[PDB]
Short mmCIF file of C-alpha atoms in Angstrom, two decimals:
data_model
loop_
_atom_site.label_atom_id
_atom_site.label_comp_id
_atom_site.label_asym_id
_atom_site.label_seq_id
_atom_site.Cartn_x
_atom_site.Cartn_y
_atom_site.Cartn_z
CA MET A 1319 -85.95 16.67 9.98
CA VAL A 1320 -82.45 15.81 11.27
CA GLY A 1321 -82.56 12.14 10.19
CA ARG A 1322 -85.52 11.18 7.98
CA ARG A 1323 -86.42 9.69 4.57
CA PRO A 1324 -83.96 7.02 3.29
CA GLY A 1325 -84.47 4.61 0.36
CA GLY A 1326 -86.66 6.80 -1.87
CA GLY A 1327 -90.24 5.50 -1.54
CA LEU A 1328 -89.08 2.04 -2.70
CA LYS A 1329 -85.86 0.64 -1.12
CA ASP A 1330 -86.51 2.18 2.34
CA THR A 1331 -86.82 -1.22 4.08
CA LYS A 1332 -84.07 -3.22 5.85
CA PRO A 1333 -83.94 -7.09 5.51
CA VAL A 1334 -85.19 -8.95 8.64
CA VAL A 1335 -85.20 -12.79 8.67
CA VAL A 1336 -88.22 -14.38 10.44
CA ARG A 1337 -90.29 -17.64 10.44
CA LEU A 1338 -93.99 -18.61 9.92
CA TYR A 1339 -95.94 -21.90 10.35
CA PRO A 1340 -95.99 -23.89 7.02
CA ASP A 1341 -99.65 -24.95 7.44
CA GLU A 1342 -100.93 -21.37 7.84
CA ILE A 1343 -98.51 -20.15 5.11
CA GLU A 1344 -100.15 -22.25 2.37
CA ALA A 1345 -103.56 -21.49 3.94
CA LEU A 1346 -102.72 -17.75 3.89
CA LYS A 1347 -101.91 -17.64 0.14
CA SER A 1348 -105.51 -18.87 -0.45
CA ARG A 1349 -106.81 -15.58 1.05
CA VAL A 1350 -104.20 -13.03 -0.17
CA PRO A 1351 -104.96 -10.58 -3.07
CA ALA A 1352 -103.59 -11.81 -6.46
CA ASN A 1353 -102.35 -8.22 -7.02
CA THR A 1354 -100.21 -8.47 -3.85
CA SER A 1355 -97.30 -10.87 -3.15
CA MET A 1356 -97.18 -12.60 0.27
CA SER A 1357 -94.00 -10.61 1.06
CA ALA A 1358 -95.65 -7.26 0.28
CA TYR A 1359 -98.72 -8.54 2.17
CA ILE A 1360 -96.70 -9.13 5.36
CA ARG A 1361 -94.97 -5.72 4.97
CA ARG A 1362 -98.25 -3.75 4.75
CA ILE A 1363 -99.52 -5.70 7.81
CA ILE A 1364 -96.51 -4.78 10.00
CA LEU A 1365 -96.61 -1.20 8.61
CA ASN A 1366 -100.18 -0.75 9.94
CA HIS A 1367 -98.97 -2.51 13.12
CA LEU A 1368 -96.14 -0.01 13.85
CA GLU A 1369 -98.59 2.93 13.76
CA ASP A 1370 -100.78 0.92 16.20
CA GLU A 1371 -97.93 -0.04 18.58
CA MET B 1210 -103.43 -29.85 8.76
CA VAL B 1211 -106.60 -29.37 10.87
CA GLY B 1212 -104.80 -27.67 13.78
CA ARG B 1213 -101.30 -29.14 14.29
CA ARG B 1214 -97.79 -28.00 13.28
CA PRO B 1215 -94.58 -30.03 12.52
CA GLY B 1216 -92.89 -31.52 15.61
CA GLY B 1217 -89.67 -29.85 16.76
CA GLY B 1218 -89.43 -26.14 17.64
CA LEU B 1219 -86.40 -25.83 15.31
CA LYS B 1220 -88.42 -26.51 12.12
CA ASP B 1221 -92.00 -25.81 13.27
CA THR B 1222 -91.88 -22.63 11.16
CA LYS B 1223 -90.43 -22.07 7.67
CA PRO B 1224 -87.79 -19.30 7.11
CA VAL B 1225 -88.99 -16.12 5.34
CA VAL B 1226 -87.46 -12.63 5.00
CA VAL B 1227 -89.56 -9.55 5.87
CA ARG B 1228 -88.27 -5.98 5.34
CA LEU B 1229 -89.10 -3.22 7.87
CA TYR B 1230 -88.23 0.52 7.90
CA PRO B 1231 -85.01 1.62 9.78
CA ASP B 1232 -86.64 4.19 12.11
CA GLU B 1233 -89.40 1.68 12.96
CA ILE B 1234 -86.78 -1.01 13.75
CA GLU B 1235 -84.99 1.67 15.82
CA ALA B 1236 -88.23 2.34 17.74
CA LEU B 1237 -88.71 -1.44 18.15
CA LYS B 1238 -85.17 -2.31 19.40
CA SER B 1239 -85.71 0.11 22.33
CA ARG B 1240 -88.67 -1.96 23.65
CA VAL B 1241 -87.43 -5.54 23.03
CA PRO B 1242 -86.89 -8.03 25.94
CA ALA B 1243 -83.54 -9.58 26.98
CA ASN B 1244 -84.78 -13.19 26.48
CA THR B 1245 -86.24 -13.81 22.99
CA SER B 1246 -84.15 -12.58 20.01
CA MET B 1247 -85.70 -10.56 17.13
CA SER B 1248 -86.07 -13.36 14.51
CA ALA B 1249 -88.07 -15.42 17.05
CA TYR B 1250 -89.72 -12.46 18.85
CA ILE B 1251 -91.39 -11.08 15.69
CA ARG B 1252 -92.95 -14.53 15.07
CA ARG B 1253 -95.68 -13.81 17.69
CA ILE B 1254 -96.67 -10.54 15.96
CA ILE B 1255 -97.37 -12.07 12.52
CA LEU B 1256 -98.93 -15.21 14.10
CA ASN B 1257 -101.72 -13.06 15.61
CA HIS B 1258 -102.91 -12.02 12.11
CA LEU B 1259 -103.04 -15.72 11.14
CA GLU B 1260 -104.88 -17.40 14.07
CA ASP B 1261 -106.74 -14.40 15.60
CA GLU B 1262 -107.50 -13.00 12.12
#
């Protein structure tokens, strides 16, 4: 531990601007959990992706 | 659409902000190519979860 744990279990994430295909965006919201915003949905996806690669 | 996206690779995808953790971005920047920039490079990663999944 010489450089770990910023944010505070909430604001730990830095803003990265990206793009997604409009068709699959509106299609995606039809299959996302109502108790999870599309933003939070993408974040949990990439989170599980970084531990994979 | 059935399987087609808007013409023109400058507006084929809508702009959206995703927030990733600093150390994970720091691990990512070390393995990025010298051709495609981040905002466009990350687009392939999320796309996989749409079309493949």
